[PDB]
Ligand binder design. Structure first.
Ligand SMILES: COC1=C(OC)C(=O)C(C/C=C(\C)CC/C=C(\C)CC/C=C(\C)CC/C=C(/C)CC/C=C(\C)CC/C=C(\C)CC/C=C(\C)CC/C=C(/C)CCC=C(C)C)=C(C)C1=O
Ligand SMILES: CCCCCCCCCCCCCCCCCC(=O)OC[C@H](COP(=O)([O-])OCC[N+](C)(C)C)OC(=O)CCCCCCCCCCCCCCCCC
Ligand SMILES: CCCCCCCCCCCCCCCCCC(=O)OC[C@H](COP(=O)(O)OCCN)OC(=O)CCCCCCCCCCCCCCCCC
Ligand SMILES: CCCCCCCCCCCCCCCCCC(=O)OC[C@H](COP(=O)(O)OCCN)OC(=O)CCCCCCCCCCCCCCCCC
Ligand SMILES: CCCCCCCCCCCCCCCCCC(=O)OC[C@H](COP(=O)(O)OCCN)OC(=O)CCCCCCCCCCCCCCCCC
Ligand SMILES: CCCCCCCCCCCCCCCCCC(=O)OC[C@H](COP(=O)(O)OCCN)OC(=O)CCCCCCCCCCCCCCCCC
Lengths: 98, 317, 163, 96, 112, 344, 80, 97, 105, 67
């Protein structure tokens, strides 16, 4: 609840401040103000294949306290490594390069 | 009296941010051998009220934007999140207690990216779209370095609760165990605000960025939300790395010392703006993808071992 | 309320109906980002703090954001007014009410009662999601390995496609 | 100093968890007799009143085992005040 | 009708003291009042039914009140100063009320 | 392909079916299906020709939605039985979903539109894998769950496939698509006997693999995607004309060759189970499949089509040989019939 | 090989560290006197309640009382 | 839950109808496709959570990890298409006829 | 399954966690752990064709430990009854509804 | 000189401790003089609820052992 109240209040403040913004003020061509970034898309799915990486690395805080601590260590290191080798391939592929 | 808490939690950060607009103009000034505001108030203490009470009165020109729905949802998303990442902040007594607190701060921080995407896309312009795509690349790329620094560090306090970081620091600052993390964290907090030697977006000399087509109110909010989490990502460093005193009695001392170190880390960003030429968009990435991310992943692997071989596995709770 | 979940469930269907009318590529992304917010909330309702936040952390800003990203790069040609779609969407907003209505009169029902958190230990700890997700490293370490290869060979699949 | 300290936080947890070990009997005893006092007291409100039309058998366990079905949150407080249902169904998620 | 004990039966004198004092006198409540509490568990985990071990339950609700009753006569004042600080915390840590602990333990090492 | 990538992909395309087969936790069966989807897409666009991108984008969407439907079945089961795997009790609709979905990945019957088109835009090689090492995975999942699936639907998808495959094939002149159509048909017979005697599905598959793998390595020996192209086989390489003749008639059910056994025992098993309605109609249009097989026979062997003068140039040069597998899989396929009893 | 590391330490002075700590953390656990305790300090925590077994008289070790000299006594975790 | 579990299931069917009724842009489809994975993820997490079946929570996430890459492949095909045609309309994908 | 490379190799990477009664982390038994056991130690050695008729008591129960629907129908019916009677005041919110009645530890 | 940047910080130096002292005294005044107990794991809640049951409807109230 409290969290609801807060997050909701935080919104109302935001909205009001734009409410007042568009109303307090109360033509002229005042309003008058692309190729693919293949690099970007790559960077983007590089981040997708890595954000999911974190999602599989967030259990560490609660797995450190597993009885088979030796197992956790092993399982984690491989993940971090296989993902580093992936990044490394990208490096060689020069995908990381902009 | 829970509502008394929000009213004493959001007023004292919108009234602080306001005087960071001032302090970001004087400290930069005296380095430039030039006094900042001195006139509207005694020593510029009354300047943000002027351009607060001024920007909001300028025409919020919806300039042939593709979609107002976005033009007027992006700027609100930002100040909505930024003023929310404060709700679980771990003061000696946090507004709200949230197990998974640090995740909350990470997640909400991420959503911000949209503001860039939405604002850039809605306002039809080359600069706007250009800047956005490039800007988020940075933001997203830096999340992956923040998370790990965030994760790694966790193994040490052993939970996702901000409020425990204080205990973990009951007798020492985590800056000394992890200064490598704290370095890269600083840049991942200094460059995830699209701030500092790293202001690629809103490239002003090169790009005129996304907030370009914004003015008056819609701009103010975007701004208010860049200085209200310029204080978060230093307020976290004063929790995660710099651990002030916590005594069951005298529960202010923490807040007082929290002050003393958050202003430095909020005044440390100000030396940066006035000191470093901006990184070029390619270099920023290569800083994270080919330098920080490697060190971050390896040190994460180092921190999962440190508990096991030092038998220091932190206590859940 | 007690209908804490239903209402939300209803919002999730609304967002899915929005994605289903296939609105403009990025206007609907928002739609997903909306129902992802909604689904994040429901899971939290049942106590899955971790599992919940996870969605808000990965699908919300990781997957979806990258999605629109690409929309901007391509397939955001932004050449039927979505407003027409909103018009239809509004129709469904209440058309679904019709589907529910028949079963509404038929009636579980009357909002949502104790149809959530069936059984919870009134005492005890370690009962919390994220203890289960951390079985990737004890007693369920095969799901962890195969996910690895997904992401790992994912790198190699993507570049090869891109090249 | 992070070696020697986090070890102690462990030894304080054992001190703090073994306290919890000593009080499972008192709580589990109270919790048994409490929930075993709700549904005789709800069996009544269902039987003492609210049930005089035909073809109803009070206490018609729907399972066949006759073993102790740990009562479900719903059956335990549901027909009781709207407040109780939340306080049992949303008390913890809402915090502290 | 599924067997459900009579409310009258369930009636038992109760501990009725807040969690803080229980957390203070717990480690001594594990030393004393153990044979009477473990047999409840040993029924509880063997006989999986709260409708059968209520016998030993009333015993647990009994030995506990016994434990405190001695503490209430014997060494009550230093016990009050112990949990009165311990309940000030937000998670009731022994880590803080560590001076109140020995002062209550020496008072109870000598007496009882 | 950086040989490393080639390894990772190929391993996945091979770990994909193998995880499916080995695991029992359906979930692990789903990800086995998921990998196969991810591994095949890179190879499909190797030429990266405009036709190819179309192929992969279709294959992927068809494969992806089916994968999601299979997952929904597993997710639903999880709530109707805590188990992560189909059981006697499973709601009938839960299983039918799995049939439709898996019949889309395998491309049977009214979902037979993607296969002919992806078989047309991919190389002959990746054509084989897309036709035969990607059918093993889904079929495994079905064969495991056979006791529980519906006899009615399977039969309808079976009969439909037989018809669609046959009719489609009659008109086609592109070889890749003639094979795609045949595979739809054979896949149909296989799924017809699944509810009754799964063990025969595994025979009607192997024989299809031992028949199609030689047939395609034949099409590519001269890399002919046209019948006109395969018709000049007599000039490019005369010996394969004899076995290409028998293998194609073997693919259809004509009695002396190995190809009769799968149809014969499937018909024997269906009559044993009393489907003498269904079996009869299937066998009859099965005869339509041989018509288009023999029309190709005519062009390639029984009649000699005219060739271009440059064909003499290709004769001069030594012809890179066909791998040994062709022979061992051509003979074991064209004539093993005398050894049927032990095969079944 | 040894003088190739010298420029890779002068220029590129990052990946060196990242492949020097990537590994260091794989050998510290296998060679430390105290790695045995992590699966033991984490094994002592009684998160759930220890169910007592019925007595038969055939069990000498099982400590009858929480304070018997018998049973898992951790004078180890203390001053570990 | 029984009530809600319905909404999520129909969400998946409404997302099903979406991916099986294309209209112009493909990115819409892939986007819809993802709407299902969210609905599956939500339903798997929900039942696992009210069955207190913690041994199965691994799955809710394995579902997302595989689904993310699945989508990665899907988008690379999409980028490949608006590089060969530059308009990403399901309309021009008909050469194979 | 189709190719049992798991039993042969003795490995159990996929079997340990297929049912609700499998080892749950920290030994936190799930709902129904009681039933599913009773419904799979029954159907062990008896094939499915005969795990579907005679071992129907244990599934009919386990189908109601987890769906828990027959309960709903009971409770939902009870609910309606209260409503009608209450409207005519035939039934009054119980002392429980009135609160108090000595809420005890 | 630089003396003047201080007026500005002084306000951002109290505007930032108003929140930490405020949240940490509106807790010790809306929780009966005692820190707001933290229910992080099921067992903490139970104890907290139990307390409410034992005395007043307020967790904060506490029974010394004379009850
Ligand atoms: C290069 O980018 C930049 C600009 O754009 C070009 C700037 O103009 C500026 C200069 C801008 C400013 C001095 C600040 C602009 C306006 C503000 C003061 C925003 C703050 C407004 C407020 C409403 C604060 C008051 C808070 C409340 C709502 C009261 C709460 C009770 C800077 C520093 C900058 O970085
Ligand atoms: C303390 C810091 C934060 C402060 C936030 C709030 C700041 C504002 C405090 C109250 C200000 C109230 C007046 C705001 C401006 C009102 C509009 C105005 O001045 O006139 C312009 C408006 C519009 O200007 P206009 O009609 O001359 O048109 C200008 C030319 N075009 C059309 C291109 C825009 O004039 C009016 O229509 C009458 C306004 C009367 C307002 C009520 C008195
Ligand atoms: C138009 C302008 C733009 C509009 C949108 C702007 C952005 C909106 C989002 C801003 C950022 C919100 C981030 C929320 C992330 C999820 C928070 C969460 O999961 O924690 C809730 C918490 C979970 O339980 P637990 O962690 O155990 O709590 C500690 C004690 N147990 O305990 C709870 O479950 C509390 C109850 C759930 C609250 C979840 C957050 C609700 C947000 C509601 C927003 C709308 C407000 C009402 C309308
Ligand atoms: C397991 C690892 C876990 C952590 C993995 C982190 C990511 C690993 C990435 C490997 C990258 C390999 C590579 O391709 O590097 C190319 C690099 C030059 O590339 P680039 O940085 O683009 O140069 C532009 C300069 N303006 O040129 C180089 O290769 C420089 C390599 C320097 C380091 C090589 C290894 C040194 C190991 C030292 C160990 C300790 C020795 C004492
Ligand atoms: C017996 C079984 C019958 C099963 C249904 C068969 C229906 C007929 C099939 C052939 C119909 C005739 C061919 C042409 C159909 C068509 O053109 O509609 C496609 C539809 C509209 O989008 P678009 O592709 O742009 O078409 C615009 C045409 N000027 O594209 C879409 O609709 C995309 C999806 C958006 C609408 C559905 C969204 C989900 C919510 C549905 C609510 C109920 C809608 C009822 C209609
Ligand atoms: C059950 C009976 C089934 C039917 C058996 C009889 C039919 C066998 C199958 C024939 C199918 C192809 C018919 C058309 C063939 C055309 C061959 C041709 O055009 O000649 C060229 C070809 C290759 O030429 P090359 O060997 O390289 O040297 C000569 C170069 N001009 O020259 C050659 O190919 C030479 C080698 C041809 C293959 C020899 C086969 C001989 C007949 C096999 C009969 C088997 C009978 C089994 C009876 C079983 C009873 C239980």
């Amino acid at each position: 609840m409290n969290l609801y109240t807060v997050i909701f209040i935080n919104i109302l403040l935001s909205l009001t401040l734009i409410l007042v913004a568009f109303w307090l003020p109360q033509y002229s061509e005042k309003a008058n103000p692309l190729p693919f970034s293949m690099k970007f898309f790559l960077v983007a799915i590089t981040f997708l294949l890595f954000d999911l990486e974190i999602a599989l690395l967030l259990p560490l805080p609660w797995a450190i306290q597993t009885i088979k601590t030796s197992t956790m260590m092993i399982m984690a290191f491989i993940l971090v490594t296989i993902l580093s080798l992936g990044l490394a391939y990208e490096w060689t592929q020069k995908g990381l390069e902009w | 009296m829970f509502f008394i808490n929000i009213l004493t939690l959001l007023v004292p950060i919108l009234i602080a941010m306001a005087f960071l607009t001032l302090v970001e103009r004087k400290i930069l000034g005296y380095m430039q051998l030039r006094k900042g505001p001195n006139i509207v108030g005694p020593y510029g203490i009354l300047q943000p009220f002027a351009d607060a009470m001024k920007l909001f009165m300028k025409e919020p020109m919806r300039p042939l934007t593709t979609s107002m729905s976005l033009f007027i949802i992006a700027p609100t998303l930002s100040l909505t999140l930024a003023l929310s990442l404060w709700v679980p902040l771990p003061m000696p007594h946090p507004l709200i207690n949230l197990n998974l607190g640090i995740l909350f701060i990470l997640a909400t921080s991420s959503l911000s990216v949209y503001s860039i995407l939405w604002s850039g896309w809605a306002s039809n312009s080359k600069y706007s779209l250009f800047g956005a795509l490039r800007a988020v690349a940075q933001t997203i790329s830096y999340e992956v370095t923040m998370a790990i620094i965030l994760l790694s560090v966790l193994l040490m306090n052993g939970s996702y609760s901000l409020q425990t970081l204080i205990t973990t620091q009951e007798h020492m600052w985590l800056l000394l165990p992890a200064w490598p993390m704290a370095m890269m964290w600083f840049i991942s907090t200094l460059a995830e605000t699209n701030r500092a030697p790293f202001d690629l977006t809103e490239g002003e000399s090169e790009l005129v960025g996304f907030n370009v087509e914004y003015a008056a109110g819609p701009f103010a909010l975007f701004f208010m939300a860049e200085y209200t989490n310029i204080i978060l990502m230093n307020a976290l460093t004063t929790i995660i790395f710099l651990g002030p005193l916590y005594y069951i009695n005298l529960p202010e001392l923490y807040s007082t010392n929290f002050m003393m170190e958050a202003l430095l880390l909020s005044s440390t960003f100000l030396w940066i703006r006035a000191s470093y030429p901006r990184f070029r968009y390619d270099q920023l990435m290569h800083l994270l993808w080919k330098n920080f991310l490697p060190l971050t992943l390896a040190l994460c692997m180092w921190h999962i071992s440190l508990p096991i071989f030092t038998a220091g596995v932190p206590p859940y709770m | 309320m007690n209908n804490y979940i239903f209402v939300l469930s209803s919002l999730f269907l609304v967002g899915c109906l929005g994605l289903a009318l296939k609105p403009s590529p990025i206007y609907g992304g928002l739609g997903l980002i909306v129902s992802g917010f909604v689904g994040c909330l429901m899971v939290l309702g049942f106590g899955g703090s971790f599992l919940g936040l996870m969605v808000f952390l990965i699908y919300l800003g990781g997957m979806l954001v990258v999605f629109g990203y690409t929309t901007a790069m391509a397939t955001e040609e932004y050449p039927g007014s979505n407003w027409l779609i909103l018009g239809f969407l509004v129709l469904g907003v209440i058309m679904e009410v019709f589907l529910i209505c028949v079963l509404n009169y038929y009636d579980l029902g009357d909002g949502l009662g104790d149809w959530l958190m069936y059984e919870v230990d009134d005492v005890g700890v370690m009962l919390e999601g994220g203890i289960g997700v951390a079985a990737m490293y004890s007693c369920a370490t095969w799901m962890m390995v195969v996910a690895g290869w997904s992401l790992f060979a994912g790198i190699f699949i993507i570049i090869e496609i891109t090249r | 100093r992070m070696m020697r300290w986090n070890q102690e936080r462990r030894r304080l947890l054992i001190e703090d968890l073994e306290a919890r070990i000593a009080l499972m009997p008192l709580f589990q005893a109270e919790k048994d007799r409490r929930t075993l006092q709700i549904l005789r007291e709800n069996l009544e409100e269902e039987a003492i009143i609210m049930k005089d039309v035909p073809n109803w058998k009070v206490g018609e366990s729907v399972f066949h085992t006759t073993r102790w079905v740990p009562p479900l949150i719903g059956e335990m407080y549901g027909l009781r005040t709207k407040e109780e249902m939340s306080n049992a169904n949303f008390g913890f998620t809402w915090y502290t | 009708i599924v067997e459900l004990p009579t409310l009258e039966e369930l009636k038992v004198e109760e501990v009725k003291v807040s969690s803080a004092v229980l957390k203070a006198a717990a480690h001594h409540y594990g030393a004393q009042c153990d044979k009477t509490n473990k047999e409840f568990m040993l029924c509880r985990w063997e006989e999986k039914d709260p409708r059968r071990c209520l016998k030993e339950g009333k015993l647990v609700n009994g030995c506990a009140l016994n434990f405190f009753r001695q503490i209430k006569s014997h060494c009550a004042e230093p016990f009050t100063e112990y949990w009165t600080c311990l309940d000030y915390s937000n998670m009731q840590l022994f880590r803080h009320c560590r001076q109140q602990q020995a002062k209550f333990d020496q008072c109870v090492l000598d007496k009882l | 392909m950086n040989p490393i990538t080639l390894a990772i992909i190929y391993f996945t395309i091979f770990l994909g079916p193998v995880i499916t087969m080995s695991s029992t936790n359906l979930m692990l069966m789903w990800v086995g299906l998921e990998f196969s989807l991810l591994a095949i897409i890179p190879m499909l666009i190797n030429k990266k020709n405009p036709r190819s991108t179309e192929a992969a984008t279709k294959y992927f969407v068809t494969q992806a939605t089916a994968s999601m439907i299979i997952l929904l079945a597993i997710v639903l089961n999880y709530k109707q039985l805590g188990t992560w795997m189909f059981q006697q009790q499973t709601n009938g609709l839960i299983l039918n979903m799995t049939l439709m979905a898996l019949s889309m990945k395998l491309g049977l019957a009214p979902f037979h539109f993607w296969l002919p088109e992806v078989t047309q835009g991919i190389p002959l090689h990746m054509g084989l894998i897309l036709l035969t090492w990607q059918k093993i995975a889904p079929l495994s999942i079905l064969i495991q769950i056979y006791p529980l699936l519906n006899s009615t639907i399977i039969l309808m998808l079976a009969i439909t496939s037989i018809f669609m495959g046959a009719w489609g094939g009659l008109n086609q002149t592109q070889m890749r698509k003639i094979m795609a159509y045949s595979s739809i048909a054979h896949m149909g017979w296989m799924l017809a006997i699944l509810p009754y005697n799964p063990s025969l599905t595994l025979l009607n598959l192997m024989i299809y693999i031992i028949l199609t793998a030689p047939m395609f390595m034949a099409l590519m020996l001269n890399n002919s995607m046209t019948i006109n192209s395969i018709s000049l086989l007599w000039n490019k390489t005369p010996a394969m004309l004899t076995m290409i003749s028998l293998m194609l008639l073997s693919l259809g059910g004509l009695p002396p060759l190995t190809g009769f056994l799968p149809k014969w025992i499937i018909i024997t098993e269906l009559m044993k189970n009393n489907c003498l309605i269904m079996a009869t109609l299937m066998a009859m249009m099965a005869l339509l499949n041989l018509f288009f097989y023999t029309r190709l026979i005519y062009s390639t062997s029984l009649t000699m089509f005219p060739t271009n003068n440059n064909s003499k140039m290709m004769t001069h040069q030594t012809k890179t040989k066909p791998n040994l597998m062709f022979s061992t899989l051509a003979i074991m396929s064209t004539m093993t019939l005398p050894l049927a009893p032990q095969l079944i | 090989i040894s003088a190739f590391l010298k420029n890779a330490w002068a220029k590129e002075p990052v990946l060196v560290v990242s492949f020097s700590v990537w590994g260091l953390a794989i050998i510290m656990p296998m060679i430390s006197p105290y790695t045995k305790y992590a699966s033991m300090i984490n094994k002592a925590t009684p998160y759930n309640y220890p169910v007592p077994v019925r007595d038969d008289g055939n069990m000498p070790d099982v400590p009858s009382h929480p304070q018997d000299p018998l049973g898992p006594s951790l004078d180890w975790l203390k001053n570990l | 839950m029984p009530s809600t579990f319905f909404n999520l299931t129909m969400a998946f069917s409404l997302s099903l109808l979406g991916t099986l009724m294309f209209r112009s842009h493909l990115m819409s489809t892939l986007l819809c496709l993802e709407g299902m994975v969210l609905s599956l993820f939500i339903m798997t997490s929900v039942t696992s959570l009210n069955s207190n079946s913690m041994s199965s929570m691994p799955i809710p996430i394995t579902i997302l990890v595989f689904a993310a890459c699945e989508a990665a492949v899907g988008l690379a095909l999409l980028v490949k298409v608006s590089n060969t045609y530059g308009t990403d309309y399901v309309q021009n994908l008909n050469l194979l006829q | 399954p189709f190719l049992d490379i798991q039993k042969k190799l003795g490995i159990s990477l996929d079997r340990h966690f297929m049912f609700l009664s499998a080892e749950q982390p920290y030994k936190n038994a799930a709902r129904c752990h009681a039933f599913e056991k009773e419904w799979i130690e029954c159907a062990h050695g008896i094939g499915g064709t005969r795990a579907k008729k005679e071992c129907k008591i244990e599934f009919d129960d386990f189908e109601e430990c987890l769906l828990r629907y027959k309960t709903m129908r009971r409770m939902h019916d009870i609910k309606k009854q209260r409503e009608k009677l209450m409207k005519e005041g035939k039934y009054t919110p119980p002392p429980h509804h009135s609160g108090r009645e000595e809420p005890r530890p | 000189m630089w003396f003047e940047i201080l007026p500005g910080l002084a306000i951002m130096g109290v505007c930032l401790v108003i929140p930490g002292v405020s949240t940490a005294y509106i807790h010790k005044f809306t929780n009966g003089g005692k820190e707001k107990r933290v229910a992080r794991v099921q067992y903490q809640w139970y104890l907290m609820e139990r307390d409410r049951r034992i005395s007043g409807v307020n967790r904060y109230y506490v029974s010394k052992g004379l009850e």
